[PDB]
Design an enzyme around this catalytic site. Structure first.
Site, PDB file in Angstrom:
ATOM      1  N   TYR C  26      -9.909  17.840 -28.637  1.00  0.00           N
ATOM      2  CA  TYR C  26     -10.096  16.442 -28.286  1.00  0.00           C
ATOM      3  C   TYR C  26     -11.039  15.765 -29.266  1.00  0.00           C
ATOM      4  O   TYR C  26     -11.930  16.398 -29.841  1.00  0.00           O
ATOM      5  CB  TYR C  26     -10.641  16.301 -26.858  1.00  0.00           C
ATOM      6  CG  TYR C  26     -12.119  16.586 -26.733  1.00  0.00           C
ATOM      7  CD1 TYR C  26     -12.609  17.880 -26.834  1.00  0.00           C
ATOM      8  CD2 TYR C  26     -13.026  15.559 -26.505  1.00  0.00           C
ATOM      9  CE1 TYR C  26     -13.958  18.145 -26.718  1.00  0.00           C
ATOM     10  CE2 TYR C  26     -14.377  15.815 -26.388  1.00  0.00           C
ATOM     11  CZ  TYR C  26     -14.838  17.108 -26.495  1.00  0.00           C
ATOM     12  OH  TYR C  26     -16.184  17.367 -26.379  1.00  0.00           O
ATOM     13  N   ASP C  37     -18.021  11.909 -30.399  1.00  0.00           N
ATOM     14  CA  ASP C  37     -17.977  13.364 -30.352  1.00  0.00           C
ATOM     15  C   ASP C  37     -16.550  13.834 -30.589  1.00  0.00           C
ATOM     16  O   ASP C  37     -15.598  13.202 -30.126  1.00  0.00           O
ATOM     17  CB  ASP C  37     -18.496  13.894 -29.010  1.00  0.00           C
ATOM     18  CG  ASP C  37     -17.966  15.275 -28.683  1.00  0.00           C
ATOM     19  OD1 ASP C  37     -18.512  16.265 -29.214  1.00  0.00           O
ATOM     20  OD2 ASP C  37     -17.003  15.372 -27.897  1.00  0.00           O
ATOM     21  N   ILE C  56     -16.251  15.519 -17.274  1.00  0.00           N
ATOM     22  CA  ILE C  56     -16.089  14.208 -16.661  1.00  0.00           C
ATOM     23  C   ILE C  56     -14.743  14.150 -15.953  1.00  0.00           C
ATOM     24  O   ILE C  56     -13.752  14.739 -16.400  1.00  0.00           O
ATOM     25  CB  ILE C  56     -16.230  13.084 -17.702  1.00  0.00           C
ATOM     26  CG1 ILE C  56     -15.470  13.432 -18.981  1.00  0.00           C
ATOM     27  CG2 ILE C  56     -17.695  12.787 -17.965  1.00  0.00           C
ATOM     28  CD1 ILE C  56     -15.716  12.460 -20.104  1.00  0.00           C
ATOM     29  N   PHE C  99     -10.085   9.219 -25.394  1.00  0.00           N
ATOM     30  CA  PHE C  99      -9.994  10.601 -25.845  1.00  0.00           C
ATOM     31  C   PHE C  99      -8.603  10.873 -26.396  1.00  0.00           C
ATOM     32  O   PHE C  99      -7.602  10.604 -25.726  1.00  0.00           O
ATOM     33  CB  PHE C  99     -10.302  11.575 -24.704  1.00  0.00           C
ATOM     34  CG  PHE C  99     -11.749  11.609 -24.304  1.00  0.00           C
ATOM     35  CD1 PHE C  99     -12.668  12.337 -25.040  1.00  0.00           C
ATOM     36  CD2 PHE C  99     -12.189  10.917 -23.190  1.00  0.00           C
ATOM     37  CE1 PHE C  99     -13.999  12.371 -24.674  1.00  0.00           C
ATOM     38  CE2 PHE C  99     -13.519  10.947 -22.818  1.00  0.00           C
ATOM     39  CZ  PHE C  99     -14.425  11.675 -23.562  1.00  0.00           C
TER      40      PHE C  99
END
Ligand SMILES: O=C1CN(/N=C\c2ccc(-c3ccc([N+](=O)[O-])cc3)o2)C(=O)N1
Lengths: 141, 883, 107
Positions: C26, C37, C56, C99
C-alpha cells in the site's frame, strides 16, 4: 647549438640587427628592439617541442638541477659529469599524482621508449635541453 | 513550510515526425487517427510506480525536460497543459487527473489497443480502448501550433505505434473521415521516432550536445503569393495573353504524351485516354478559364514584382515559326503538338535568377485555388478524395517535383523573350558546475564541431548570465567559429572558420593571464602578430569551460578524464605544459545548461529599469506595493509579467463599520489593483495565475491564454461535468474605460478589485466600485497567485493594494495561518513582487535514460521500449508547486 | 466511509475470510497530493488480520472487498480513520486518506 652560439656572443646579435635594419627585412612574413621577431629565436621556439618530446617527464626533476649547474658558466662536459654523479635523484613517479598520466602517455602511443635503459643517453638528452631552456630565458628578459 | 523530499522516477516521451494543424488551409483533413498497442508493462518495477500515458501534444509549449518540473516531477503527456493524455482511466490535462468511465476500467495492461482521434473542425480529442469508446473528450483548446502524437513512459514498458498501414497495421476500423495518421509525412523528410526537445544525444565517442531545434509553425503550410490584385495589364501585355497560352499548353501536352497520353473520354493511365490533346481554342470549358487566368498570372507576377519590360523587337516575332516534330508526337486521333522555336534566344543570368521566383509564385497561386476548392495534402494520392501529394506550397517540396514547375516557367519566360519583348529557442549555453572554478595552473579542453554554425566555445566567469549571448559582457572569453571571431566585448576576427568536424583546443594560462585557441593542431593567429587571443586578464573569482551551441547545431565537449581520447593534445598543448581540465577525477564533470523555461523570480534590488517600493498603510490607505520605471527617459520599455510571491489554496467543499458575526465567519478575500493616471488601462491586465504559468509572451492578450474543456458523459451524450481548465484568470483593463473618455489621456486613476471565495470557488472582478459581468469558477485544491500584467507607458506604472472592504477579510488572512481571523491588512516581508524571467540555469542529469529508449521500425508498427530503472531525489517547494 | 475503486482487476472469487492473514502493498497519501507513508520503500509487505484489527478500520473495509491481486484506491473519511485526534508529525486532525492498495496475499 646555433641558438646558443648566437646567444653567447654580442657580435652575432649586433651583426644580425645591423643586417636586418640595413636590408629592411620584414622578419615577420617568414613566420606569417625587434628581438621577439628574430629568425633564430622563432626557429628555436618552433623546434623546441621536438627536443622536449625526447626527454622523459622523469628528467624534469633533473632539469632544474642542470639549469642551476649551468648557472655558474659551466661547460657541457662538467655538467654531464655532475649529472651522472647523482643520476639517481630522478623519478618520484609514485610520489606525485601529476606524473602518472604523463608516464602513461609516454609509454603508450610512441614506439620504442629508448630501449627503456640508457644511463649514458639520459645525460646527453638532458644537457642539450637544459642549455636550450637556459639560453631561451635571457631572450625574453 | 519545510522543503520536502522524495524519490521520483525519470519519465521521457517519444513522438513520430507527424505534424497536423489548423490554419487558413492547405493542411486540413479535419480528422486524424492513430493507435498505440501495449506489449508488456511491469507495474512496479521500481518503488514508486510505472508511468505510461498516450495522447496528443502541442509543438510550441510541450517540452518535458528530464528530472524535475511541475508538481512532483516526472512530466509526460498530461502535465503542463500543452498536452492531452489518457493513462488507462484518467484524462490527464493541465496537471490534475480527472477519472473517466469505461466498460471495465483498468490501467494500460499488456495486450491493450488504445486509439486516439483528433478533430480540428471542432477542437476535440477522443480515445477508444479495445474498441469500446471512452466517455470523455477534450474541447475548446487553442490551436496555436501543430499537433503530434506522443507517448510518455518510464522504465519498463514496451509499446508499438500502429500509424496507418505499411507503417503499422490497424486493429480497429477508424471512424469515417479520419486519416490514419500516415499522411502529412512532408515528403522532404521520412518517418522517424524521436524525442521532444532534446539537449543531449549519444554519439560515437561520447554524449553530443544539441542546441535548439528548428520547429515548424502552423502558418507554414498555408500558401501566400505576392499581391497581384492591382495589375492593369496594359494593351501590349494584354495582347500577348492567349498568345503565350497555347505554347505552354502544347508543350505540356507533349510532356504528357512522353509517357504515352492519348486523346480520349476518360482519364486513366491504364486506359491511356486522358483528354488533353486539343488546341487552346478547342479546350473544354471547365479548365479553359483556369488556364487563361494562370497564363495571365504568369505575366502579372513579372508586372507586380517590377522589372519593367518593353517591346525590344517585333519584326523577329513576325517571322518565327514552328519547329519540326517526328511521328512519335502524332497520335491516333490526329493531334500534333506545335512547339514554337526556342533555340533562337538565350536567357541572361539575371533571367535565370528571376525565373525561379515566378515558379515560386505560380506554385503558391496554384495551391491557393486548390485549397479554395477544398483540396488538402495527403501522402497517398486520392483523386476522388480531392487530394494529391503536392499541396506543400514551396519550401517543403521534394526536389524531384521542384524541377517541373521551374521547367514550365522557364519555357514561358523564354517564349516571352523569344517574341522580342526584352524582360529586365535563442541559444543553448552549456557550462560547468561552479565548484570547478580554476584560479591557478594551466588547463586544456577540446570542443569538436560536428556541424558548422553559430557555436561558441571558451572560458567564462562563474557568474555567467544565461539570457545574454556569450561575449556581449565581460563574463566570457569565447571564440566564434561561424566566421572566425574572438568575443570578450566585441567581434574582432581571430582566424578562419571551421569545417564538418574540427576540434578546437582551448587552453587558459593563469600564470601570466593568457588565453589561446587552436584549430586542429595549429595555433590560431589574430590579425597582425598576437599569437594569443586575450592577454593580461585580471584573474578574479575563476574560470569555467563554456559552450554556446546555436539553433540546429551539434557539438562535442571533451573536458578530459581520458588523455588518450584527446585527439590533438600531444601535438599542441602537452609539451608546453597544459593539464587537461579533468585528469584525476573518477566522475565526469557535471554540466549546467540554460533551460528556456520562464520561471518567476523576485525583482532584483538593483534592477536597471524597474523598482519596487514598499509603503506602510496610513489611516486612510492600506499597505501597498508600488512599481516605478526609473529609466523612462531613453531606456528599455517592454511588457512584463508579475505576481505576488505567495498563493492561497481553495478549501475542500467536501459608517464603514464591520460587525463580528459575519466578518469572522466569511470566506471571501479581497485585493485591489490601482492603475495610476497616465498609464493606459488597455495595457494592464489584473487577475490571478496558477503555479504552472510559463508564458513569456511579448504580444500578450486575452486571446493567447491557455484553455481547455473536459467533458464527461454517459454512454450516449447527457454530459454531467464540463470543467474549464486554465492557468490565467484576469480581465482586460481596456474594458473599463468609457467610450467618451477613450481617445486621449485621462487624469483619474483606475482601481480594479478581485474577490475570491475559498468556500465555493467563485471569482469576481469590480472596477471603480462597479461590479463587472465576467466571472470565473475554479476547482478545490487550486493555488492562485495575485498577478498583474502591465506594459509600462509611464514612470508611475502600477501599485498593488492589499486593501479591505465591507467584511471581505483582506488578503493577508488566507496566505498566513497565524492571522486567520485578523481583519487588518498586512504585508509581511515574505510577500513580495516576483517578475517573470526568460531563461534560467539548470542541472544536466549525470545519467540519462541510458537505454536511450531503444526503438526500431518493426514490421508490426514502430516499437519503443525502456528497460532500466532510474530514480532521483526530488526537492519539492510547497508554496510554488514545483520540483 | 470507503469509496473503493479499481485499478487492476483480480480474480473476483477469492475474497478474504475471517481469521486470515492479508498481505498488502500500500501507498498512503492525504487528500492534497502529499504522500505520508508507503510500504514499497521499506521493501516488505504489510500483514494484518481480520478481527484483530491493529489497523485503521477503513483500511479494513477496503481490504475486505478485494480478490487476490485487485489494485484499488480506498478513500477513508474522518470518523472512519484516525479522526480528530490525528497523528503527531503525521496526518493532520481533520483530513481524509487515500490508499493505493494491492492484495498480493499468498495465504
Ligand atoms: O494537376 C493536374 C490536373 N490535371 N488534369 C487537368 C489539367 C488540364 C490542364 C492541366 C495543366 C497541367 C499542368 C500545366 N503546366 O505544367 O503549366 C498546365 C495545364 O491540367 C492533371 O493531369 N494534373
Amino acid at each position: 647549438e646555433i641558438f646558443i652560439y648566437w646567444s653567447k656572443s654580442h657580435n652575432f646579435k649586433r651583426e644580425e640587427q645591423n643586417f636586418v635594419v640595413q636590408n629592411e627585412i620584414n622578419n615577420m612574413s617568414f613566420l606569417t628592439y625587434s628581438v621577439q621577431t628574430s629568425l633564430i629565436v622563432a626557429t628555436l621556439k618552433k623546434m623546441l617541442p621536438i627536443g622536449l618530446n625526447m626527454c622523459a617527464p622523469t628528467d624534469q626533476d633533473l632539469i632544474m638541477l642542470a639549469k642551476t649547474r649551468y648557472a655558474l658558466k659551466d661547460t657541457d662536459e662538467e655538467v654531464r659529469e655532475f649529472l651522472q654523479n647523482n643520476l639517481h635523484l630522478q623519478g618520484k613517479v609514485e610520489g606525485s599524482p601529476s606524473l602518472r598520466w604523463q608516464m602513461a602517455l609516454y609509454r603508450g602511443l610512441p614506439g620504442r621508449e629508448e630501449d627503456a635503459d640508457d644511463p649514458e643517453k639520459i645525460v646527453r638528452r638532458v644537457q642539450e635541453v637544459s642549455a636550450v631552456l637556459y639560453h631561451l630565458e635571457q631572450t625574453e628578459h | 513550510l519545510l522543503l520536502q523530499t522524495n524519490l521520483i522516477n525519470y519519465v521521457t516521451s517519444i513522438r513520430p515526425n507527424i505534424f497536423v494543424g489548423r490554419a487558413e488551409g492547405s493542411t486540413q483533413y479535419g480528422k486524424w487517427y492513430f493507435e498505440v498497442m501495449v506489449d508488456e508493462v511491469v507495474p512496479f518495477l521500481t518503488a514508486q510506480a510505472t508511468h505510461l500515458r498516450v495522447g496528443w501534444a502541442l509543438t510550441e509549449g510541450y517540452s518535458p525536460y528530464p528530472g524535475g518540473g511541475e508538481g512532483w516531477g516526472g512530466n509526460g503527456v498530461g502535465d503542463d497543459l500543452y498536452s492531452y493524455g489518457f493513462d488507462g482511466l484518467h484524462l490527464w490535462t493541465g496537471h490534475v487527473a480527472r477519472p473517466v468511465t469505461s466498460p471495465g476500467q483498468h490501467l494500460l495492461a499488456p495486450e491493450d489497443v488504445v486509439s486516439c482521434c483528433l478533430d480540428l473542425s471542432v477542437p476535440s480529442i477522443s480515445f477508444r480502448i479495445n474498441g469500446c469508446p471512452v466517455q470523455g473528450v477534450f474541447e475548446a483548446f487553442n490551436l496555436d501550433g501543430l499537433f503530434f502524437p506522443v507517448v510518455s513512459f518510464s522504465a519498463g514498458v514496451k509499446v508499438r505505434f500502429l500509424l496507418g498501414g505499411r507503417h503499422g497495421e490497424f486493429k480497429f476500423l477508424p471512424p469515417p473521415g479520419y486519416a490514419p495518421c500516415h499522411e502529412a509525412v512532408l515528403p522532404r523528410e521520412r518517418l522517424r521516432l524521436e524525442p521532444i526537445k532534446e539537449y543531449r544525444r549519444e554519439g560515437p565517442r561520447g554524449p553530443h550536445l544539441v542546441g535548439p531545434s528548428r520547429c515548424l509553425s502552423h502558418t507554414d503550410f498555408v500558401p501566400c503569393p505576392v499581391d497581384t490584385v492591382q495589375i492593369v495589364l496594359p494593351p501590349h501585355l494584354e495582347r500577348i495573353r492567349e498568345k503565350l497560352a497555347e505554347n505552354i499548353h502544347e508543350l505540356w501536352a507533349l510532356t504528357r504524351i512522353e509517357q504515352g497520353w492519348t486523346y480520349g473520354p476518360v482519364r486513366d493511365d491504364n486506359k491511356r485516354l486522358h483528354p488533353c490533346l486539343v488546341n487552346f481554342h478547342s479546350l473544354p470549358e471547365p479548365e479553359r478559364n483556369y488556364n487563361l487566368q494562370m497564363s495571365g498570372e504568369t505575366l502579372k507576377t513579372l508586372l507586380a514584382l517590377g522589372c519593367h519590360v518593353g517591346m525590344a523587337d517585333e519584326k523577329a516575332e513576325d517571322n518565327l515559326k514552328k519547329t519540326k516534330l517526328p511521328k512519335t508526337y502524332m497520335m491516333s486521333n490526329g493531334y500534333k503538338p506545335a512547339p514554337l522555336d526556342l533555340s533562337h534566344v538565350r536567357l541572361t543570368p539575371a533571367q535565370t535568377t528571376l525565373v525561379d521566383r515566378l515558379a515560386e509564385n505560380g506554385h503558391n497561386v496554384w495551391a491557393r485555388d486548390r485549397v479554395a476548392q477544398g483540396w488538402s495534402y495527403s501522402a497517398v494520392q486520392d483523386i476522388p478524395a480531392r487530394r494529391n501529394p503536392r499541396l506543400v506550397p514551396y519550401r517543403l517540396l521534394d526536389e524531384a517535383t521542384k524541377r517541373s514547375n521551374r521547367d514550365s516557367l522557364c519555357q514561358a519566360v523564354r517564349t516571352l523573350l523569344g517574341y522580342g519583348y526584352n524582360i529586365e529557442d535563442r541559444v543553448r549555453i552549456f557550462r560547468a558546475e561552479k565548484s570547478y572554478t580554476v584560479q591557478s595552473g594551466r588547463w586544456y579542453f577540446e570542443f569538436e564541431a560536428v556541424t558548422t554554425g553559430e557555436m561558441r566555445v571558451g572560458w567564462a566567469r562563474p557568474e555567467l548570465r544565461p539570457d545574454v549571448e556569450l561575449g556581449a559582457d565581460e563574463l566570457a572569453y569565447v571564440f566564434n567559429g561561424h566566421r572566425g571571431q574572438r568575443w570578450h566585448l566585441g567581434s574582432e576576427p581571430f582566424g578562419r572558420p571551421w569545417q564538418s568536424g574540427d576540434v578546437v583546443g582551448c587552453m587558459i594560462d593563469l600564470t601570466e593571464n593568457t588565453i589561446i585557441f587552436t584549430l586542429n593542431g595549429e595555433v590560431l593567429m589574430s590579425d597582425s602578430g598576437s599569437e594569443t587571443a586575450f592577454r593580461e586578464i585580471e584573474i578574479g573569482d575563476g574560470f569555467l569551460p563554456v559552450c554556446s551551441l546555436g539553433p540546429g547545431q551539434v557539438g562535442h565537449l571533451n573536458l578530459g578524464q581520458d588523455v588518450s581520447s584527446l585527439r590533438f593534445f600531444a601535438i599542441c598543448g602537452l609539451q608546453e605544459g597544459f593539464e587537461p581540465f579533468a585528469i584525476n577525477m573518477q566522475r565526469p564533470v557535471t554540466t549546467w545548461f540554460s533551460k528556456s523555461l520562464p520561471q518567476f523570480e523576485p525583482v532584483p534590488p538593483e534592477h536597471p529599469h524597474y523598482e519596487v517600493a514598499r509603503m506602510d498603510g496610513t489611516v486612510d490607505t492600506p499597505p501597498c506595493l508600488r512599481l516605478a520605471h526609473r529609466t523612462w527617459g531613453s531606456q528599455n520599455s517592454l511588457v512584463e509579467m508579475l505576481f505576488l510571491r505567495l498563493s492561497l489554496p481553495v478549501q475542500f467543499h467536501q459608517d464603514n463599520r464591520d460587525d463580528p458575526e459575519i466578518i469572522l465567519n466569511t470566506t471571501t478575500y479581497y485585493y485591489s489593483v490601482r492603475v495610476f493616471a497616465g498609464q493606459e488601462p488597455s495595457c494592464v491586465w489584473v487577475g490571478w495565475v496558477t503555479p504552472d504559468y510559463h508564458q513569456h509572451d511579448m504580444n500578450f492578450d486575452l486571446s493567447k491564454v491557455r484553455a481547455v474543456t473536459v467533458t464527461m458523459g454517459d454512454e450516449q451524450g447527457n454530459v454531467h461535468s464540463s470543467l474549464k481548465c486554465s492557468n490565467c484568470y484576469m480581465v482586460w483593463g481596456g474594458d473599463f474605460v468609457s467610450p467618451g473618455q477613450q481617445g486621449r489621456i485621462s487624469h483619474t486613476d483606475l482601481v480594479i478589485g478581485c474577490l475570491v471565495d475559498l468556500a465555493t470557488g467563485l471569482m469576481t472582478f469590480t472596477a471603480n466600485g462597479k461590479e463587472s459581468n465576467t466571472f470565473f469558477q475554479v476547482e478545490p485544491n487550486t493555488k492562485l497567485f495575485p498577478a498583474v500584467f502591465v506594459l509600462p507607458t509611464h514612470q508611475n506604472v502600477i501599485q498593488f493594494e492589499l486593501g479591505k472592504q465591507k467584511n471581505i477579510m483582506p488578503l493577508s488572512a488566507a496566505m498566513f495561518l497565524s492571522e486567520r481571523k485578523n481583519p487588518a491588512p498586512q504585508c509581511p516581508p515574505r510577500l513580495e513582487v516576483q517578475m517573470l524571467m526568460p531563461v534560467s540555469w539548470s542541472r544536466m542529469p549525470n545519467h540519462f535514460l541510458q537505454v536511450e529508449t531503444r526503438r526500431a521500425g518493426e514490421r508490426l508498427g514502430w516499437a519503443v521500449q525502456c528497460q532500466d530503472p532510474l530514480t532521483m531525489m526530488a526537492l519539492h517547494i510547497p508554496e510554488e508547486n514545483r520540483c | 466511509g470507503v469509496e473503493i475503486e479499481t485499478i487492476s482487476p483480480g480474480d473476483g472469487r477469492t475474497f478474504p475470510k475471517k481469521g486470515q492473514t492479508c498481505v498488502v502493498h500500500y501507498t498512503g497519501m492525504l487528500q492534497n497530493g502529499k504522500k505520508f507513508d508507503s510500504s514499497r520503500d521499506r521493501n516488505k509487505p504489510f500483514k494484518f488480520r481480520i478481527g484483530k484489527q491493529e489497523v485503521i478500520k477503513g483500511f479494513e473495509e477496503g481490504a475486505a472487498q478485494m480478490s487476490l491481486g485487485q489494485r484499488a484506491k480506498l478513500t477513508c473519511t474522518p470518523d472512519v480513520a484516525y479522526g480528530a485526534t490525528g497523528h503527531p508529525g503525521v496526518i493532520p486532525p481533520n483530513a481524509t486518506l487515500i490508499f493505493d492498495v494491492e492484495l498480493l496475499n499468498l495465504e
